[PDB]
Amino acid sequence: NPSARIMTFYPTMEEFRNFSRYIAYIESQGAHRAGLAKVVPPKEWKPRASYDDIDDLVIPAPIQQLVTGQSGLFTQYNIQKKAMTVREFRKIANSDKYCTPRYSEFEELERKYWKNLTFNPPIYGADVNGTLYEKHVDEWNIGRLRTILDLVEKESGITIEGVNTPYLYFGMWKTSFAWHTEDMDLYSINYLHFGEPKSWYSVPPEHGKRLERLAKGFFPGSAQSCEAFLRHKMTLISPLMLKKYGIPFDKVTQEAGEFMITFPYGYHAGFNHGFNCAESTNFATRRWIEYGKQAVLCSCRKDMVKISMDVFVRKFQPERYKLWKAGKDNTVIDHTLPTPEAAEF
Ligand SMILES: O=C(O)/C=C/C(=O)O
Ligand code: NI
Numbered sequence: 102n103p104s105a106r107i108m109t110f111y112p113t114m115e116e117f118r119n120f121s122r123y124i125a126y127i128e129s130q131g132a133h134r135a136g137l138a139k140v141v142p143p144k145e146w147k148p149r150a151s152y153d154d155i156d157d158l159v160i161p162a163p164i165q166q167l168v169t170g171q172s173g174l175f176t177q178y179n180i181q182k183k184a185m186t187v188r189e190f191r192k193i194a195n196s197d198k199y200c201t202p203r204y205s206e207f208e209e210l211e212r213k214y215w216k217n218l219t220f221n222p223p224i225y226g227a228d229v230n231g232t233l234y235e236k237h238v239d240e241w242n243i244g245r246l247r248t249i250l251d252l253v254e255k256e257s258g259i260t261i262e263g264v265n266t267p268y269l270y271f272g273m274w275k276t277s278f279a280w281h282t283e284d285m286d287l288y289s290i291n292y293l294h295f296g297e298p299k300s301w302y303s304v305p306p307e308h309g310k311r312l313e314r315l316a317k318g319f320f321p322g323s324a325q326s327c328e329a330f331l332r333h334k335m336t337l338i339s340p341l342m343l344k345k346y347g348i349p350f351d352k353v354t355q356e357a358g359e360f361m362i363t364f365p366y367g368y369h370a371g372f373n374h375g376f377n378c379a380e381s382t383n384f385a386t387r388r389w390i391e392y393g394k395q396a397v398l399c400s401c402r403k404d405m406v407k408i409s410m411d412v413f414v415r416k417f418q419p420e421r422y423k424l425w426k427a428g429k430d431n432t433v434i435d436h437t438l439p440t441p442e443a444a445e446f
């Protein structure tokens with residue numbers, strides 16, 4: 102993938118059964134270079150039989166998204182609204198005030214998004230603790246993917262909501278997720294259970310630093326107050342602005358029943374088309390560990406997520422442990438290399 106483009110994969114059912122194996126596989130095909138990949142699951146597969154039993158599930162902290170800005174640069178402020186049911190949310194979402202506008206091609210809906218971003222602030226049913234997987238689904242179950250990120254809980258008993266536990270996201274039209282990488286620059290997986298699409302933008306890891314340099318220049322005040330201000334998840338930057346400043350990026354639209362995988366240090370952002378529902382969590386491979394060791398974290402304590410790398414280095418880099426503890430490990434990351442578990446491919 103020398104073009105670092107978003108790739109799309111159609112695993113067979115046999116390939117689908119071993120999660121870590123297939124992630125290792127798509128990396129052997131260069132997928133990680135785009136920062137983002139789509140995985141379409143076998144038609145046979147389904148995580149839940151029916152989504153009619155969820156209208157009474159509570160969204161404890163719905164978020165009203167106020168957006169301020171102009172010329173492709175925006176800052177998103179969160180206003181927490183009182184609790185709400187999935188029924189209530191859908192009712193608001195499908196109301197005339199908040200529903201999807203009519204359009205022909207995607208390119209048109211995208212233009213309207215970037216044109217009306219700051220008007221009529223929508224509500225996002227985001228960061229809801231929970232899963233919609235049926236208890237017995239053993240393939241790609243976001244609640245229990247069984248990757249080495251499990252060493253965090255296994256070793257320390259620590260749970261970090263949304264990171265090694267699942268989150269649910271109820272969206273409506275024009276609800277957004279700002280530019281960011283994952284906590285500790287982990288992987289993530291995102292499954293769209295149902296509803297209208299979710300569109301994504303992505304910047305290749307090998308160009309991540311370019312985007313940060315651009316963002317620091319456009320938000321000097323935020324940059325001075327925090328070493329990793331993009332981790333606040335408040336900064337929106339349109340594709341025209343990226344284009345204008347030569348930041349490479351790709352686009353992809355996610356349909357219900359599809360997986361998105363994001364890769365270590367892959368910046369991504371996007372928006373929802375209308376009423377929908379998504380589930381996500383983080384995960385790891387051996388390749389992540391070095392990213393974990395070098396992740397630049399939020400220094401102003403708004404983003405509190407810090408994972409101790411010690412168990413990972415000890416168990417998977419024993420020859421570098423003493424060097425690393427003494428701050429003399431100057432390993433340099435090559436974003437093009439696949440995770441070692443792909444040696445088998
Ligand atoms: O569904 C969302 O809000 C996006 C979550 C993610 O960044 O994976
Ligand atoms: Ni993310």
Ligand SMILES: [Zn+2]
Nearest residue numbers: 327399400401
């Ligand atoms: Zn910060």
